[PDB]
Design a protein around this ligand. Structure first.
Ligand code: ZN
Ligand code: ZN
Ligand code: ZN
Ligand code: ZN
Lengths: 223, 223, 223, 223
């Protein structure tokens, strides 16, 4: 199937932030205080020296939650990947609006003035966002935002950046990436089941069949 | 026909070697004398912004005089909203190369809104054998020393960045881009005919039939 | 006295955006529709190839105003300078709040991989902002903002970045800078006299005596 | 005494040449074997972030093995909120230089707020004779080839960036910095005693009396 590494924020049947390395059974999780209707901000960072994937989710007035996991991505992910955002809603009326998304990847060689870098920043999505590959119920343009799930009952959507990303190289001394997105989960329900995730996958990843709910449109089954 | 805007460096004795600005036609809209240095690494800096609406280029060599050409033009009226940017090169009948040692690009769309900037930035200082984020056309190849050989080493080649680029938007207060690339044109011949160009085209641009020589793999005819 | 180059927004006795090269008698001006109580955004840009200083002031819902002026800063300003913000209030109750300020300067040499760059971004000012030199009634910390004039009748204040800036060099092929600040001018009065300015000066510039009102704390007299 | 945090590269046979992390004391908190290469340009990459709270360093040479050392430490508890960053070097009694070919630094403070990042970034690829944005101490000088000679060419020298740096803030969700510098240690001697260090100190730090040799111009005594 696909190779997935993802930082997920879910409230399915307890809300927690977690790190998934190829399985929905989070390798590490942290208690998350999901704030309905408030804009949240996830910061994800990783570097080949530390070989540690770290995440921080904070809200204004701020209850930050953070989870880290030691892992050498060189052994998990393919050399070239595509990065993206995912979301799945349970049986509840709710949205998973992405207000902004920015990413930065760098490969520094042994070679002096070594650097290879890719950087994108979306602070406003357009109706025709040709540099985003939308999958599922994901769409753009709504207020300049990115609606991962359909806005108005079991919906899944994803948005991946068009250009493949050279996330690692055997001849780099330090490889590193950093992602940041601001989201808005609004539900009229008091305890909605929902999930958003920043994921890294093989370039041609697609929504597995049956990847709804707890599977975040990332995994085909709970193994 | 494709829509092309390109800054070209050519020595085809149509008639000194010159740097020139092409807006949809090979008969440069503006040109400047260029002192092509065989075997030395050169550096082209291209910059544009919607406020000034002036496309400018500077080509210098170490210990060098620089050559510069600017041209007033509102790209909003020439290019489509979404484009792809790339490098091109055509060799006449001479033994010579068109090695690109580095290429970096940055695009920015700043809206009327407070804190609404959209940006794309890539930097290649070392090209790998499998550069999956570059669309190679013609005789173009990568990996040779970590360089990009646009031409065969009567050759024509191009390399376009994979991700489409949002160059303009009707709602931006200042749209801008800036490109930089270092090249090496080596030829055993004393007066070789050659040509490199940084170009901006429609996303699905391809090498027109018979765009060899003085047509730089960009134009199908001068006529 | 001091050497001043500044992009000013004034409504003194008609509101206009203007470019001042060593004198308060703007070298070029544009009609400005001052919006009381609304956050505005000034973008200032300049590059040595074009040798043109350009400014854009827009508000949300947007009425943008823009003014450009052809000038080779190499002949006006000293090699090393300090950049800053200034404001002066007439006899009115009003504020000149700076919500954010960011600047970027680059010096690219003939030399391959030439770059020298300085970049700062303030999106939140602290009560002890040790990297800012405050002059006059200027203070920080108020909401995380920068109050150029005193907040509650003839007040002048300035804030300059601590580190001197190498704005030009004789051996650079392209020198360029770019500044952006968001301001809030709130006055209970319908037609208040006020002025804010982004200025470049000699490193040890200070508020001239009698630089109030129309003189923006930049000039000592109207010559 | 000054508060010093520094990543040091030393060959003083106190006992192989090593790279080490110093937190307020010259007796390194952590060290790694370093294979000092006489006459070859080296590259030190230093990185830290408040989420991981781990200070890491990588020193590589071309065609090289890299040496790396990391140390868990919350800088919030060691350093003052505002600091100055710099480079240091001390030579033993040998003929040798400590030329810094380039130095770049980036600091970021991201708040709980949506879109509230504060950043400082400098890049020196060429030092001029009058580098007004650098505070030189000891035998340090600039302009020599466009390089920075920390030591006399029993010498000690330092260079600190002029602007104080806000390294931490109690209200930031992720504070981070990253430094990179390329050096050249040439010595006619086969086993020279030498030392370079990237350090972070209180804004008004100065070379302690007798901080020569194995004290790297950073510490007044080991004892
Ligand atoms: Zn889970
Ligand atoms: Zn031509
Ligand atoms: Zn005026
Ligand atoms: Zn030691």
């Amino acid at each position: 199937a696909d190779t997935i590494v993802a930082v997920e924020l879910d409230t399915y049947p307890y809300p927690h932030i977690g790190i998934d390395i190829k399985s929905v059974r989070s390798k590490k999780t942290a208690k998350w205080n999901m704030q309905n209707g408030k804009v949240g901000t996830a910061h994800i960072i990783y570097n080949s020296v530390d070989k540690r994937l770290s995440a921080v989710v904070s809200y204004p007035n701020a209850d930050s939650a953070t989870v880290s996991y030691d892992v050498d991505l060189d052994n998990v992910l393919p050399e070239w990947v595509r990065v993206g955002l995912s979301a799945s809603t349970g049986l509840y009326k709710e949205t998973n609006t992405i207000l902004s998304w920015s990413f930065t990847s760098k490969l520094k060689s042994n070679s002096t003035h070594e650097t290879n870098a890719l950087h994108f920043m979306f602070n406003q999505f357009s109706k025709d966002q040709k540099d985003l590959i939308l999958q599922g119920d994901a769409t753009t343009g709504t207020d300049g935002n990115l609606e991962l799930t359909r806005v108005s009952g079991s919906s899944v959507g994803r948005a991946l950046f068009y250009a493949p990303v050279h996330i690692w190289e055997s001849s780099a001394v330090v490889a590193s990436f950093e992602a940041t997105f601001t989201f808005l989960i609004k539900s009229p329900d008091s305890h909605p089941a929902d999930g958003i995730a920043f994921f890294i996958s093989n370039i041609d990843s697609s929504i597995p069949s049956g990847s709804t709910g707890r599977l975040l449109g990332l995994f085909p089954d709970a193994n």
